[PDB]
Automatic annotation (TrEMBL), chain A:
Similarity remark: Belongs to the eukaryotic ribosomal protein eL13 family.
One cellular component (GO) term of this entry: cytosolic large ribosomal subunit
Species of provenance: Entamoeba histolytica (strain ATCC 30459 / HM-1:IMSS / ABRM)
Ranges that cross the membrane: none
Protein name listed in UniProt: 60S ribosomal protein L13, putative
Automatic annotation (TrEMBL), chain C:
GO CC field: cytosolic large ribosomal subunit
Signal peptide: none
Protein name: 60S ribosomal protein L26, putative
Source taxonomy: Eukaryota, Amoebozoa, Evosea, Archamoebae, Mastigamoebida
Family classification: Belongs to the universal ribosomal protein uL24 family.
Keywords: Ribonucleoprotein, Ribosomal protein
Source organism (scientific name): Entamoeba histolytica (strain ATCC 30459 / HM-1:IMSS / ABRM)
Biological process terms in GO annotation: cytoplasmic translation; ribosomal large subunit biogenesis
UniProt keyword annotation of Ribonucleoprotein present: yes
GO molecular function: RNA binding; structural constituent of ribosome
InterPro entries reported for this sequence: Rib_uL2_dom2 (IPR014722), Ribosomal_uL24_euk/arc (IPR005756), Translation_prot_SH3-like_sf (IPR008991)
Length: 232, 148, 210
RNA sequence: AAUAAAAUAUUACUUUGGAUAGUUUAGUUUCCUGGGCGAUGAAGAACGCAAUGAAUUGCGAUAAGUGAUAGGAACAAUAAAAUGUGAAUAUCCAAAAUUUGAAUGCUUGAAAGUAUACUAAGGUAUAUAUGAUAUUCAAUAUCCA
RNA sequence: AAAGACAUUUCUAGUUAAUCCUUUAAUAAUAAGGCUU
RNA sequence: GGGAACGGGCUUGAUUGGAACGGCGGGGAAAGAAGACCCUGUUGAGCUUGACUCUAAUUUAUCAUGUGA
RNA sequence: AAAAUGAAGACAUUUUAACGAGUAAGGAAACGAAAUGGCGUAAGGACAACAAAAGUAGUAAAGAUUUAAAGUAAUUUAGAUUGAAACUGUCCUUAGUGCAGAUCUUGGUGGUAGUAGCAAAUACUAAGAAGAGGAAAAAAACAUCUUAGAACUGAAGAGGAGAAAGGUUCCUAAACAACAUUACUUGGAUUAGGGUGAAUCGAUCCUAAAUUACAGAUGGAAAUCCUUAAGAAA
RNA sequence: AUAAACAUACUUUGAAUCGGCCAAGUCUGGUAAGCAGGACUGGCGAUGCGGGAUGAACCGAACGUCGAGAUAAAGUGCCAAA
RNA sequence: CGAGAAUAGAAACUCUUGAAGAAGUAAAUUAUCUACCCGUCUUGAAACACGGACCAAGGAGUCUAACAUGGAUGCGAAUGAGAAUAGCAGGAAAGCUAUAACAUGAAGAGAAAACGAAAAACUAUGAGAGUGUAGAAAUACAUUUAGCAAUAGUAUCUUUCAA
RNA sequence: AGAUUUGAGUAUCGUAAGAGGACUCCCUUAACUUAAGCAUAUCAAUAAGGGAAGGAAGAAAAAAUAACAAUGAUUUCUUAAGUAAUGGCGAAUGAAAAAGAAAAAGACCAAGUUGAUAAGAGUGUAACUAAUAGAAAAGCUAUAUUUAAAAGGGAUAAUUUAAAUUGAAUUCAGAACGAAUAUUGAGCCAGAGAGAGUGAAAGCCUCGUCAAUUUAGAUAUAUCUUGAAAAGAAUAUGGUUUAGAAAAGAGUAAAUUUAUUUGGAAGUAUAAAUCGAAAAGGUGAUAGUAUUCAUCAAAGUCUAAAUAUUACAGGAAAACUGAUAGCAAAGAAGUACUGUGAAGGAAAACUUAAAAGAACUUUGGAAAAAGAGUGAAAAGAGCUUGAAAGAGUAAUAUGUGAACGGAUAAUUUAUAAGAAAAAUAGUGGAAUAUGUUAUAAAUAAAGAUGUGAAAAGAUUAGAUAUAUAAGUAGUAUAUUUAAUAAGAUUAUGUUGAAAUUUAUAA
């Protein structure tokens, strides 16, 4: 070394020539994956959905104000949304019993995701033939359901002016099929954020933010003195 | 571009610009940072005087996410919402709506107080506040809000 | 352009496949064109050459007509009884000819040439009528957009546009300064040469008038 | 002082040599698709087989090739014979597949050999370890008359 | 004592307790590690 | 003569006809070999030894549960 | 260096003044008044007869040899001869990019030099035959075969046979380009054929020093140990 | 007093080099050395040219290619210009 | 006798040689002057120092990665986002598009706990812009204003045991 | 005698072995080297040795991170990051969570329960079995929810893979050549102007290439038939009559010590010696004890996909090499040749379009030579061109112990410079110049400020239909009805600079 330079720290003293990885296959991974995606789009047609994923908060205070897609809905979020956990995996919903319910806000946020998905979902009959039971039973209770829906319409008409179903019905009907590749791109994680405006009052004007920060800090560091004094 | 190297202008010169007395030999004092305390000590003293030794306590496993705290000065608060919004609420006061500058939404956690604020009331919402940051915000007619 | 990734546009691989081709493939490469009379009779452009055929040499020193006596697929050549050379000591040897320098003027048709000629003729008709289907559809699109014009215009002479509308763009002034010296000198020399050619032409025109 | 034999110098032609130029059925690298061997005897090795062959190629006592399916008139250095009643040529097919080699009845050095059983020759089977089933046993090991 | 949305901070005096920093979920007494000489 | 202090070449002189055969051992500080003597490398290797640091072999102690006194 | 002029002229402008040695070393490219100027090799992207046939080339490419011209020089240009199928000029981009040396690598070739040598093994001669091959003013020497003379190894041999090793060298015929330090009609050399016969000779069989298996013992492993002891084996 | 604007002040980045040797109206160790080691300056190294016959260092004088002249060191019997 | 100044005038030529070869240039020879073996180490080599018999072809500062300075370029409190990756047309190792993780930067000090920058700055010299006069051709002096860059020094502020 | 247990021989049906190992999972305590010496360290899961695998393998479903507004099997990429940390704290070595993506999938044994228990096992097969994490059996039931006769066949369609077929336009005219694709002239094709061959350069001569066709092979691709559309079956939260009153992986996790390893530092991982748990417990990386908190629940197994690849095989490309280069190998190259062996290991491309490869005579023993002949041309097989070193011939020139070079002349040779033209005076104006008119072209505009139109959407309020419906302006889709707010993009006024310079003809 001569003249002014940084102290060099290069880990090339080993055999790097056998540790060299080159990305000449990068342009062809794109073709291989895209083609496999298209064949995946068929076979399971329609709804090659990558499964509906929950809305979860990123870990740590560095990221906790952001939402991101988790893995699988908890059993309570499915029960709140009135979805059978056995049927959920077959209609493109990810399920994760490993995840514990973290907060009420998480439970409500991810139960609304399932409710929106179930309304946007169209399930085709297990048997295409028109004599399938579900299509047959749809006509059988079509007369009865009309009276059943009569009071529900007026249920939400007077009040809005525990008996809650354990499971909601699967939306099963015959329709012209339109394929959407991923349902997480249809149901947004969060709404777009606009400028927030608030009324300025004397109550907020006089608030001492720094004093509350110091008091919270000082109270945390004062628990050590209490224990020492108590043992004295 | 190998045609612009010095090797193309030293063709015909015997030693290629490395000298006849002191040849271009393999080593010039060792390999790497060798001899940092014996014969390259004048180099380490001159240019990196605190290279050798210890200072401070070890952190066996550092959680560098706990020290993450981006900061914004008071002079840079209004640029988060733009000058258009700033001029819209230029004549606001106590009683009517005042724009809220959510620093956490923009990735800033602590508000430091450096520089000057335009003389408009403003609601600054953040996680931590400097001492002068709160004074400068209050003196302008605004309020300080805590988050998280 | 070639869009088939399976075939190769490498000259070295093309010559290698030519030298190592099996006998079955060598027969097709050794093909010759039927003459005017035979083409009308069979509506076939060309067929692989065969022994006892009669050809006519159309390229080379001697344009003689003869009968095929050999089809040597190792050398990709043929022999003609009327094209020989006396090998010094008196005896004669046949002279090799490439099969693309001759045209077939008489066919030795046993039973498989008859089947081959029929197959080739039918395939020519199917492609000719397939092209007609495409041509009318391309013609139909043109007429639906230009009902006052017919598609025969594309085969006649073209009258170029003579309108010379200029556009005022604030970069013509800078154009001479946006060229490097090598291309500026060439451009200025071309301007000077072009101007001098007009000067001599004007002098010629003035003399012609008087 | 003198001669130009040898010596030296330049050019042309020729020679020794194989540079230079032009060329390429050969390489190098990257990428794509597979990654399909063997006791039903593999990879490797040896020997043998062409009308005239030494190598190489192909093949295995049916030998530079047999059948079948495609294929349609050649091969050639020379002479034969065959051939549209089907010549070349191609193959994930069928038949056949010498001695070895994990090499496996025993032996094996450059070794020639040799036993038994089944079906004189010829051909099969018989290594070691091991799973399942059957059968014949051994040990008072536990009961037990 | 003065400001504070249907809680809570600030200033003043008396008191009691803890007090150079760290061992990263919180404390404690040992232990160890930092800083200056 | 001077010069790297022992010239075939440089300076000044002596002197010179071109091509060579047989001998010869003065010279070409003649050829053979990156001196083997000497020194220097922060270059080795064989051998020696209470040089430094270790190690096989040997040795000593403890643990590893047979019964009845 | 300073003035002047400056869209393209051209020679990298015009004028004036000062200055110019050089080892080691430095001065990358681009920069109109240019923060040095250029030559050469190969490949890539463009440009190369401006009016619709647009660089050169079987009316002779590259290369080679010389003759002249331009340049301070690196080099370039053209002619002639040779050569017969590709190549060049300009701008950018790129580099496996410029050789007198490395006891450099590979190949080829000189002087030495028609020189040193073709001197151990006592030795050959005459006539004839075959053959292109002893001629000649002695060119004093002449390979193979037969005969005659003269000789050597001297029977612990330069004799007659085997083991190992070699591998067809064995025998015959044709033929002599190369090889045997001259030559060869000769040959262990070239070409083509032919040749090796076992009940009794050997191998095969037996064991010697020793060597190697199954099972067993040992080892992380490869593998090692054991050879009748450990085994319902032999 | 004299000189000094292609003056002056620099900033950054970097090369090579730190075996030196010579002279003398200088010095030290040594009998002395073409010996060893120093103070100041000029040189050679890195440098050719004219002269000292020859010479790394002496004397004159430092170099783009040339023409004509006055010169420097030093020379004017011949070699050799005078 | 005579400077200045005013008035008027008078200079455009010969010879020799050259396509029977001028001037110049090149080659070979002769003559005068002149010239030690190249590369390298070295204070110093033509050296009795080493390598080099001769010729052709090959032959040695390159590639990957980190940092820095510097010249050209884009954008600029932002820059990059050919990070992976996902799409587009065209078939494409090329090209185009993706409100985007993160990197570097916008804030610095402290071992760390804990913190976190205005007296809307001051002083000196300094770039530039006007007028007037005169020499008189350019230009030279006086006077009014402006105070950037740079340098040095000051108050004030952040962190530290310590600026 | 009989019933078992254990161990053998034989027969039958099978299984392992060897090759390959580029990529994959491991074992084993290299050194050169760096530290400017060297001994820890580094080189370095590196070389060599050894074992085992597949087209991928390994891993994989928390005794896991974290301390959050919390995540959630494994793998791979980006970032974190040359950071935390380790280190004669020297040289050097060196992660992981969070965050962003590719791909996604979860299932069983053991133990527990059920026992008129089920040819082979009762020393137990089999069935049920977890986040509301005290499960498990038999029978009735309530409410929500799921459901067509499964599996296997046959046919059509679609998407792909392979083979075969097909695939335009000058067999154009002239001149010239040994020979036409080059050349001149007139035409044509093109979803084909990638490429190869052809006496010589081809879009239109052959084969091909673009667009296609046909036939086979697959998909867990959809359609109809077999196939009826019923009986029933299933998921979850309960109630009830009997049954029952559980289990959850041991020489393991830890501990003392030793050795290696790790960034892991009073011990990150592995192993060995000793020791050794549980009315559970592990972790939160500073050792210790205590109390809380958080998060998991080890000591059995399987698992696609995203990922790697310089073996080998089949293809495609290339700012790569072009016969001393590129593989060692462009030919019978791992060949010839060397070595007892392990091993080592080359050189060598080109006639011509076509052999038309001279062919008969004279000389010679022959080889050959000279004629003759083939060919466009000897290009003559030692064959494209044919350099230098080294020789031979011819022409020219020079000469006493070197040779060569430079400046200056002389001699000789070569190169190499030209066809115009006088004085004066009569005619005769021809290029140009001066300046007058006319014509043409070019040269001035950067911006500033006004008025509209508008796709795609966005928000809100209504209407119809479908699906679903929690007592939260019900949601979602499709089609319609009005309103606001902006709007990429786009149309058009006003404003604001001329009078010069060249050329052309009188």
């Amino acid at each position: 070394m001569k003249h002014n330079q940084a102290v060099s720290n290069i880990h090339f003293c080993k055999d790097w020539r056998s540790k060299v990885h080159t990305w000449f296959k990068q342009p062809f991974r794109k073709i291989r994956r895209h083609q496999t995606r298209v064949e995946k789009a068929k076979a399971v047609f329609p709804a090659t959905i990558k499964s509906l994923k929950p809305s979860v908060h990123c870990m740590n205070q560095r990221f906790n104000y952001k939402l991101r897609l988790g893995r699988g809905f908890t059993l309570k979020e499915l029960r709140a949304a009135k979805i059978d956990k056995n049927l959920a995996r077959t209609i493109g919903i990810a399920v994760d019993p490993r995840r514990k319910e973290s907060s009420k806000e998480c439970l409500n946020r991810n139960a609304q995701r399932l409710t929106e998905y179930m309304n946007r979902l169209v399930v085709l009959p297990k048997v295409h033939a028109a004599t399938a039971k579900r299509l047959v039973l749809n006509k059988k209770n079509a007369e009865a359901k009309t009276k059943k829906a009569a009071e529900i319409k007026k249920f939400i008409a007077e009040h809005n002016k525990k008996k809650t179903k354990q499971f909601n019905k699967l939306p099963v009907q015959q329709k012209e099929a339109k394929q959407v590749l991923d349902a997480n791109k249809v149901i947004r994680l969060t709404a777009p954020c606009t400028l927030e405006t608030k009324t300025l009052t004397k109550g907020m004007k006089a608030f001492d933010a720094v004093a509350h920060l110091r008091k919270a800090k000082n109270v945390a560091k004062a628990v050590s003195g209490i224990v020492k004094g108590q043992k004295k | 571009a190998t045609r612009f190297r010095q090797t193309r202008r030293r063709r015909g010169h015997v030693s290629m610009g490395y000298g006849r007395i002191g040849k271009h030999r393999k080593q010039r004092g060792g390999r790497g940072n060798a001899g940092g305390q014996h014969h390259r000590k004048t180099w380490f003293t001159t240019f990196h005087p605190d290279y050798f030794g210890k200072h401070g306590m070890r952190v066996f496993h550092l959680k560098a996410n706990k020290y993450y705290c981006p900061s914004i000065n008071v002079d840079s608060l209004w640029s988060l919402v733009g000058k258009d919004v700033q001029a819209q609420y230029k004549n606001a006061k106590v009683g009517e709506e005042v724009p809220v500058i959510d620093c956490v939404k923009h990735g800033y956690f602590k508000v430091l107080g450096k520089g000057f604020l335009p003389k408009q009331p403003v609601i600054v919402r953040a996680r931590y506040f400097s001492e002068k940051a709160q004074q400068k915000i209050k003196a302008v007619g605004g309020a300080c809000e805590l988050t998280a | 352009m070639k869009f088939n990734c399976k075939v190769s546009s490498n000259p070295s691989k093309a010559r290698k496949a030519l030298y190592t081709a099996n006998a079955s493939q060598r027969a097709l490469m050794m093909s010759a064109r039927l003459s005017k009379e035979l083409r009308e009779k069979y509506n076939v452009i060309a067929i692989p050459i065969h022994k006892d055929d009669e050809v006519k040499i159309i390229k080379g020193h001697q344009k003689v007509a003869g009968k095929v006596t050999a089809v040597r697929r190792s050398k990709y050549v043929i022999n003609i009884d009327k094209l020989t050379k006396t090998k010094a000591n008196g005896q004669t040897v046949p002279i090799a000819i490439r099969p693309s320098n001759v045209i077939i003027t008489k066919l030795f048709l046993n039973k498989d040439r008859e089947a081959l000629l029929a197959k080739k003729a039918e395939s020519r008709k199917s492609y000719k009528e397939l092209v007609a289907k495409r041509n009318e559809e391309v013609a139909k699109a043109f007429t639906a957009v230009y009902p006052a014009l017919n598609m025969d215009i594309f085969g006649k002479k073209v009258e170029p546009i003579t309108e010379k509308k200029p556009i005022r763009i604030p970069s013509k002034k800078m154009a001479e300064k946006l060229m490097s010296k090598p291309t500026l000198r060439a451009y200025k020399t071309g301007i000077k040469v072009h101007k001098a050619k007009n000067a001599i032409a004007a002098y010629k025109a003035a003399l012609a008038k008087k």
